[PDB]
Design a protein around this nucleic acid. Sequence first.
RNA 1: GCGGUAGUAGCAUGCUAGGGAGCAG
RNA 2: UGACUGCUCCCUAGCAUGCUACUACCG
Lengths: 293, 78, 187, 190, 102
Amino acid sequence: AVGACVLCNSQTSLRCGACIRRPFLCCKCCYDHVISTSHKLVLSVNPYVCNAPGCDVTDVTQLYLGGMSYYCKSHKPPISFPLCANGQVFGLYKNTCVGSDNVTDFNAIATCDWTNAGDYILANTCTERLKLFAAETLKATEETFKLSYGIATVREVLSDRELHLSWEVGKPRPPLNRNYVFTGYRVTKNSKVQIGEYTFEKGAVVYRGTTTYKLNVGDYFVLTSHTVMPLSAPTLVPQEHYVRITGLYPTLNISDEFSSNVANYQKVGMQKYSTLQGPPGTGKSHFAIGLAL
Amino acid sequence: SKMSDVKCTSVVLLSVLQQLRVESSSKLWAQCVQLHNDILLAKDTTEAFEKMVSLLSVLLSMQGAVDINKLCEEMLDN
Amino acid sequence: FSSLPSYAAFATAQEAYEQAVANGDSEVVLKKLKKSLNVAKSEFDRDAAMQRKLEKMADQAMTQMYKQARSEDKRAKVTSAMQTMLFTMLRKLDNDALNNIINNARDGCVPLNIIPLTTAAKLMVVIPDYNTYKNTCDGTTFTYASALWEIQQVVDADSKIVQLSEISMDNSPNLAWPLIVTALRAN
Amino acid sequence: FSSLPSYAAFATAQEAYEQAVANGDSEVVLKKLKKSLNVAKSEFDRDAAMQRKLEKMADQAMTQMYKQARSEDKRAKVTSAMQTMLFTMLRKLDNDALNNIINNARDGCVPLNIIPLTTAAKLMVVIPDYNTYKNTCDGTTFTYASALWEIQQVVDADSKIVQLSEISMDNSPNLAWPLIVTALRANSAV
Amino acid sequence: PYPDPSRILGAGCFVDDIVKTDGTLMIERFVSLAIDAYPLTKHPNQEYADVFHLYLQYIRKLHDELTGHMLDMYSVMLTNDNTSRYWEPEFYEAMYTPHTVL
RNA sequence: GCGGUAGUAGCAUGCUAGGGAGCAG
RNA sequence: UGACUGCUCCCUAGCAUGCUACUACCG
Ligand SMILES: [Zn+2]
Ligand SMILES: [Zn+2]
Ligand SMILES: [Zn+2]
């Protein structure tokens, strides 16, 4: 429930009703999220909606906080004060809030379909946590637009590595190589049953065997995906070079078969993070073992 | 004051043991329940302590379960 | 409640009427002033209580939502809370047998069954290093849980019997170390 | 609340009266203003009160009818569930042994306690300890209720399979003892 | 009538549910428990009245904890209007005096 | 000059309905 | 998985009655 909006540095219990990750936005922050774009629905500890039976109001800009509940516009007991008023949205942390100077971060990159280059452009023009939000939203959009294609299935089976394959109802098909593993499940009558891992490239349907299989009637193959949880630790560590070689277990011998190892050994002696830009044959083959010894 | 403390500790210990899915073994759960019910009815503070040792041995003889060392480094048990 | 237009109108009317009356005047002026004053006074007095009721109701609603959020949070950390509490009380008890077995388990010597209380019945522990064997087992007697036990069997990870005379400082490091001592409670 | 039928007349009369007042005319026009505005507000009062009463009455009626509809839907679904349960449990009556013992009755009525005793296909036995076990279901086939049953499976209190080769006097204290034995009617029903 | 003090203390210390090991979430439990334990103050034995006094002090402590604990991280300011009645004996003395109310 | 009537506001009293909790057989 | 009764405290909503107050109509 109680998460964290960090650009305004505001603990929050609110979240946007119709958005990517149910993102967390503080009172004023949810406000300029819902006036700079169209997101007229929010979620709190309880969802804001009129509580009389049979009533239906999606909007929040006209709801009222009644007798320990919420009531609305078309069906109006108005003995209350409005929920959305005075540059803020009613909730906890209604006083300890800051706001945002850059009004259109979400309004820019959380409002497009997460496929333009501008998303990554702004993600690189971000902070560590803002770009964390960016990366998690890229994984979310990857999965949410992967879950919009078909599920392959073998209903009558043929000889292995040459079968027949019908797919789904009306949906398109993704790219063709082994990038998408066709690892689905089998249904006997209501349950899911051991299937294995498959991949469809050649179609008469030629399959590549990640395992040896005895396919039965109806066997369905598709990637069923969960959603990546939020992460709690930073990606990169800030650059701080060491005072000395304190806390190391030094050795006496020096690597000789590797002709560019000793100075880099000393570097690891006082370097905290280390990235390089290299094709195959750049120490990835032997320098790791060099540090190991 | 040394008796109510051990009764409260026994209640907490039985709760912790129940949280670890111990009642999925009928014999162990029956023994634990018998020990816990016997501690609360005690009148002198030596039988309660030996039964407490016996009951704690059940939690200690479960390898994965909990981390004795981390739970001892948190300004907790010595 | 001095932040509403009704308050401003009522204050101006009050000041005007008070000044006119203190200056001294006739009856019709007083009547007109009070007929123009009382409506503004009622206008102020209604909101003066409506605002108070609204404010207290909002405070109560925020209180209730905080309570609900806190209860939902609390009912989701019970395992860790209970374990921490249990070990805190176990500290506070301060018993020698409990301390002995807790330290033994913390160093690696845990039992394999329920510790018996009778003058009989078997107890099995695991001794993973020579130092624990040095501390606990000396001679043919076993000290565990502030009691005394008598060794009768030693079994290794390969399940072969090892005689007591075999175990020694330099004579040990050629063995499967997770030994299993089976003893009975001495009288 | 702003376009009521009397609102036009009230507002027009108020505007005209206040224009006459702003004209600075005699006191007679002021008295006429006061009387007309007083009666206008008096007639606007009930037109502003009765409408508000009626709206709340209508809202209450709507809410009550909605909840009635929901109750009817719930009744329909519970009726469907009960019918399904009855027709599902019907399909296990073993309609030949039951018919055979019903026809032997002199008027069609039989006690309920003897229907499972003479027509059931499966038997379940719960055994406290080994002494009771060796007197009731020893071996692989036993006799109970003037019939012959043969064992099919044995589980323990934890619902794990137990083989008859390890139910002995020496190995008794190593089992979760509330054992459950399942048998089939031999030569008769299953 | 007065109950057994052990019953009242056991009801205080041992609960079903986990959400009742946080007094601020339910202060109305202790008000009822102190209503049940009022007549113990007329008992010649001394701990019996101490039970009722302990309950009153715990109620006051819980209220103070709630107000401060809510004013601190949030900024909502609480008032103590007609709340002090719950830690003074006159609210509980009126339940055993013959005058029907409510 | 006094009373009646029509709205409006605050306060008090008893019931009905909803929710949370305590004790007893 | 959570029976039948009885009593009591707290919060909100509605109804009825009473007290006071502010305007207006009528005599
Ligand atoms: Zn949004
Ligand atoms: Zn924000
Ligand atoms: Zn509504």
